[PDB]
Each structure stands twice: as structure tokens, then as C-alpha cells.
Amino acid sequence: APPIMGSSVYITVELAIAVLAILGNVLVCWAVWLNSNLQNVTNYFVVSLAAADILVGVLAIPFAITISTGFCAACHGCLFIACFVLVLAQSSIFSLLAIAIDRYIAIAIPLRYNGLVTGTRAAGIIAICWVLSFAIGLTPMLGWNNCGQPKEGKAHSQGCGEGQVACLFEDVVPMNYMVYFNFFACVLVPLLLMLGVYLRIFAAARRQLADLEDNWETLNDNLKVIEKADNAAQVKDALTKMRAAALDAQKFRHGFDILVGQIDDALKLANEGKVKEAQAAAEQLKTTRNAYIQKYLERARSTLQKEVHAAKSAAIIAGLFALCWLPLHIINCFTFFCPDCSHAPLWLMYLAIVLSHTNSVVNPFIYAYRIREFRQTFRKIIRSHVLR
């Protein structure tokens, strides 16, 4: 079968992906520039990772189409064509790592967050991450390559000029780089870290909710104790547990300013031994509870759920990165570790490459389904500018 008919399917699919990559991720960048509600440190990393996906469509995918022809070229120019995509992939791992650490700080030290994270420091972290991304991804050009042992049978067959090679990924890029250095050290290790960070985020959130609900059950069982109590020694106890629980839940001020004051007064009645005026005084507490602290515990509960919903959106993007990228890394593993195995067939190579490229399309859809601010901003731009 002429190679050119299978080539035409591959190339057509690649071009289709490129257009979706650029369109959807240019829309993300327009939303964030326009809507100031979307201008948070969290979203500057999302614009960084949108940039990487845009350049997959404009550069990486065109590079992949041409490397697959075997065209004659100077070996070091082949390596750049072949490795630029490793730069863009590394950049996305750092952006993904950053968003996880950012969402963890948000949930773990909400007090200090705005102090510790700032948009000026953010831009710094992003620049450094791109420089690093070029460094990791183009390490083969500093000498860790196969340019020094060219396949001159294949150069002469293709009729390349002198000094030229048949430009093929697995010919110029060594497989020990790809498996030990790129996959194990630079992709897989960072991904396991994200797994761990996200584990603590959901753990700290599950345990923050529990602490709220405990303070709520501590506050009302103690209340049942004062109600049908007997001695002033046990009214005291049932009110000491309420004050500690009040101060714990504090970490709006009016509702608590009164509640702790009301405990204080009812306590001194108990201490001078007036039992039943201290009792009766602790039912006016019920009033402050329903009027203030329960609006407090309800809206604190609502906010933790917002933060967890946002952290779950970020985890889905990281998970989809791994899904789309592991097949190629696993095939390379087979290629490198089993020289007794037959090399994966060409049609499977191209499915795995195509699949790693698909990751550049999916993120815009996740924002639109899962984050209402993005979805409404998307709606406003399409209707306002494209369609009307």
C-alpha cells in the first residue's frame, strides 16, 4: 500500500487537532484578559498552560508532521524539530504542579494566602518555569543524542547530502533519555507529587468540615445539659465546654461578641451558686445561636464546598494530562526494555502521538462545564463578537 494513503489520514487528523487546540485556548486567554473576576494568581498559571497548548497547534504539531517523512536534514536541526514538544510538555507539568500547590495553600492557610501568593511573584515563578522547560526538553542538543552514529545506509537510500540524516525521532533521540530522564525523572515523579498534594487537600478539607460540625454538636449537647441540670457544679462544666467551642469555631464578630458575653454572665451566676437564674440565662443563648452563629456555620460550610469543587476541577485536568500522555511513554518503555519484542506497529505509534496531542484540546471544555465564571464569560464573547 503506498505510504501516502495512510500518511494522509494521520496528517489530516493532526491538522484538525491543531485548529481546535488554538481556537479553544485562545478563548481561555481572551476570557481572562477581559473578565477581571478571572484575574487571580490561580488563573495566570491557567494562561501559562493555555499558551503551551496554543504552541502545540502552531509549532509542535507541524513539527511532528514533518519529522514523520524522514526528510534529509542536518542532524542537530532534526533534534530541535524532534525535541521542542518536550519543552511544551515540561512547561505544562510545572503549571499543573503550581496550581495544585496554590489550591493547597488556599485551603491550608486561608489567612495568609493573599500575603504569601501575589501576582508579581506568580509571574516570576512562571518565567523561571519556562526557562527550566527549555533546559530539560532540549538537553539532547547538548550532546546526549545519536548524531554521532548516523544511519548512513538510510541516508544514502533517501539520497541525503553529505552531513545530512534521515530525520526520524527514534534515530536521533536516544531511548535512555526518554525512559530514564524524561519519563521517570521529569514526568512521572512530578505526577506522583501532584497525587500526594491533592490527597492532603481533600484530607484537610474533610477534616475542616468535621471540626465545624463537632463545635456545633458540642454547643448544643452542652445546652441540653444546663437545661435539666441539678447542681451549679455541672452548669459550670456545661458552660466551660461551650466557651471553648465558641472560640474554636471563631477560627460575624457581633454574633460571637454576644454569645461569649452571654456565656460569661451565665457563668458568674453559677459560680456564686445561683443555679436557676444561670439556667434560665442560658436559654437566651438559644436566641443568639439561631440569629447569628448558625448563619456563620452555614456560610462557612458553603465556602469549603466551593474550594473543594475548585480543587476537583484542577485534579481532573492533571488526571487527563496523565491519561493522554502515558500510552506513548509506556510504548517507549517496551521499545527500550524489550529488544526481544517486536516494535509497536506504525498505526499504534500514530494513535499514541495523536492522543498526546489531543490533551491540548480538552482543558477549555473542562472550564466551561465546571466553572461558572468561565462559562458565562465564554457565552458573552461568543454572542457579543462572533455571532452578533
Ligand X SMILES: CC(C)CCC[C@@H](C)[C@H]1CC[C@H]2[C@@H]3CC=C4C[C@@H](O)CC[C@]4(C)[C@H]3CC[C@]12C
Ligand Y SMILES: CCn1c(=O)c2c(nc(/C=C/c3ccc(OC)c(O)c3)n2C)n(CC)c1=O
* The one-letter amino acid at 388: R
Q: Binders of ligand OLA among 202-261, rule CB under 6 A?
A: none
- Nearest-10 crossing angle of helices 75-108, 119-137: 150
Question: Is there binding between residue 364 and ligand OLA (CB under 6 A)?
Answer: no
* Closest to 230 measured CA to CA, from 276, 280, 286: 276
The footprint of ligand OLA on this chain (CB under 6 A) covers a number of residues equal to 73
Q: Binders of ligand X among 327-366, rule CB under 6 A?
A: 327, 330-331, 333-334, 337-338, 341-342, 344, 348
Q: Name the residue nearer to ligand OLA (CB basis): 187 or 293.
A: 187
From the list 110-118, 278-286, 348-356, 367-375, the region that binds ligand Y by CB under 6 A is 348-356
Maximal C-alpha separation, the chain: 106
Would you give the binding string for ligand OLA spanning residues 24-63, x where CB under 6 A is met?
Answer: -----x--xx-----x----x--xx--x--xx-xx---x-
Q: Name the residue nearer to ligand OLA (CB basis): 289 or 329.
A: 329
Q: Three-class SS of residue 39?
A: coil
* The one-letter amino acid at 366: I
Question: Is there binding between residue 92 and ligand Y (CB under 6 A)?
Answer: no
Q: How far is the CB of 227 from ligand X (least distance, A)?
A: 56
Q: Which does 369 bind (CB under 5 to 8 A by kind): ligand OLA, ligand X, Na ion, none?
A: none
Question: Is there binding between residue 310 and ligand OLA (CB under 6 A)?
Answer: no
* Closest to 275 measured CA to CA, from 238, 220, 221, 242: 238
Question: Is there binding between residue 61 and ligand X (CB under 6 A)?
Answer: no
From the list 224-232, 254-262, 294-302, 337-345, the region that binds ligand OLA by CB under 6 A is 337-345
Q: Name the residue nearer to ligand Y (CB basis): 62 or 255.
A: 62
Give the ranges where the chain is alpha helix by DSSP (H). Answer: 3-34, 41-55, 61-67, 75-108, 110-116, 119-137, 152-157, 169-172, 175-176, 189-227, 232-250, 253-271, 275-281, 284-288, 294-337, 346-370, 372-381
Question: Is there binding between residue 180 and ligand X (CB under 6 A)?
Answer: no
Would you give the binding string for ligand Y spanning residues 157-176, x where CB under 6 A is met?
Answer: ------------xx------
Q: How far is the CB of 327 from ligand X (least distance, A)?
A: 4
Q: Are 81 and 63 spatial neighbours (Cβ–Cβ below 8 Å)?
A: yes
Q: Name the residue nearer to Na ion (CB basis): 98 or 285.
A: 98
Q: How far is the CB of 92 from Na ion (least distance, A)?
A: 4
In degrees, rounded to 5, the angle at the alpha carbon of residue 86 between the alpha carbons of residues 83 and 91 is 140
Q: Binders of ligand OLA among 115-144, rule CB under 6 A?
A: 123, 126-127, 130-131, 134-136
Q: Three-class SS of residue 63?
A: helix
C-alpha cell at 85: 514538544
* Closest to 167 measured CA to CA, from 64, 66, 71: 71
Rule CB under 6 A: choose which of 49, 55, 56, 81 binds ligand X.
Answer: 81
Q: Three-class SS of residue 73?
A: strand
Rounded Cα–Cα distance for residues 354 and 328 (Å):
10
CA dihedral 45, 51, 53, 55 (to 10 degrees): -150
From the list 95-103, 156-164, 236-244, 346-354, the region that binds ligand Y by CB under 6 A is 346-354
Q: Binding site annotation covers 170?
A: yes
Query: Which positions lie near ligand X, rule CB under 6 A?
Result: 73-74, 77, 80-81, 326-327, 330-331, 333-334, 337-338, 341-342, 344, 348
Residues placed in the known binding site for adenosine: 170, 332, 356-357
